[model samples]
Target: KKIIETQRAPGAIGPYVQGVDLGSMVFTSGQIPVCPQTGEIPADVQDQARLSLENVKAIVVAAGLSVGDIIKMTVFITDLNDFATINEVYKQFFDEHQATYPTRSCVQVARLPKDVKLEIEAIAVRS
Candidate 1:
């Protein structure tokens, strides 16, 4: 396994790498919408989703892959009511990538590590 890191994405505050590669595939830990530079969480759901997806892109790139190589994604939100807003932002991200839409799952949770409204993670093939 190989660890992935880059300042382009938010640094893990605790003990974790941004992503890991197991030869044929890469797995990214859940990413919050905190900006890497400012460390501020966006207040708007769609904006948060965009930042979170950008963080995912950074990690994927650090793993020597691209968003087009993603096979699956799992998104977690603090509220289920934000699903439509999240989905709207999600579409914007994938719409610009080359791969087919990845298989995805979204869940509402009571809380997340940073209490951010959104978190996103992904599994991708190493092309």
Candidate 2:
């Protein structure tokens, strides 16, 4: 796997990777809401969820691809109840990118780093 890197997105923050290229596709490591530029978490879940996609896109750019190439995604959240808002932003996210909707799975976890409420990872294929 080719390790992907760019300061536009948050680092592994520990012993981890932000993304990796596997030739045919790129797999982005789970991304949180902490602003990659300021290292500040957002105030609302609306903005928070968008950053999840933003961070995923940042790594996607380093993968030599873009948002449209993404094929699948997984969302992690602390509460399943937040699924509604998650769908709203998710729908608008790819729509604005003019990309077909990718397969997605959302799950509730006991905890997430810094309680960011939502986290996302990406899988995008390369031509």
Candidate 3:
């Protein structure tokens, strides 16, 4: 296993690497909307979702993979009501027009670190 770190993404607030590369696959830690350079969290749900996914994409790329290499994703949201809006932003990062988008599971959670509205983690295979 190899540890992955990138300044393009927010640094881990706790004791964890941004991602781990296991030769054939890579796993990313849950990404929040905090900007790496500004440390800003967007108030808008759509903006938050975009930033979170961008962080995930940075980690994935740090592992020598692309968004298309992602095979699965797990999303945690504080509000299920924003699901559709988040989905709209999500499809922008993943291929929405493809017959097979990455497998995913989304759940509404009571809360998350930094009190952010959402967090996302991903798994990708080496292509």
- TM-scores, all candidates, are 0.95, 0.95, 0.95
Q: Which ten residues in a row have the lowest lDDT in candidate 1?
A: 92-101
By TM-score, is 1 or 3 better?
Answer: 1
Model 3: clashing residue pairs?
none
Model 3 superposed RMSD (Cα) = 1.7
Candidate rank order under TM-score: 1, 2, 3
Candidate 3 Cα lDDT to native:
0.91
lDDT score, candidate 1, position 119: 86
Candidate 2 per-residue lDDT, tens place, 18-108, comes to 9999999999889999898899999888898888899999999988898999999999998878788878888898999998988988899
Best by lDDT: 3
Candidate 3: tens digits of C-alpha lDDT, residues 23-102: 99999999999999999999999999999999998999888888888889999999999999999888876764242478
Off by over 4 Å in 1: none
- What tens-digit string does per-residue lDDT give for candidate 1 at 44-91? 888899999999999999888899999999998899888888888888
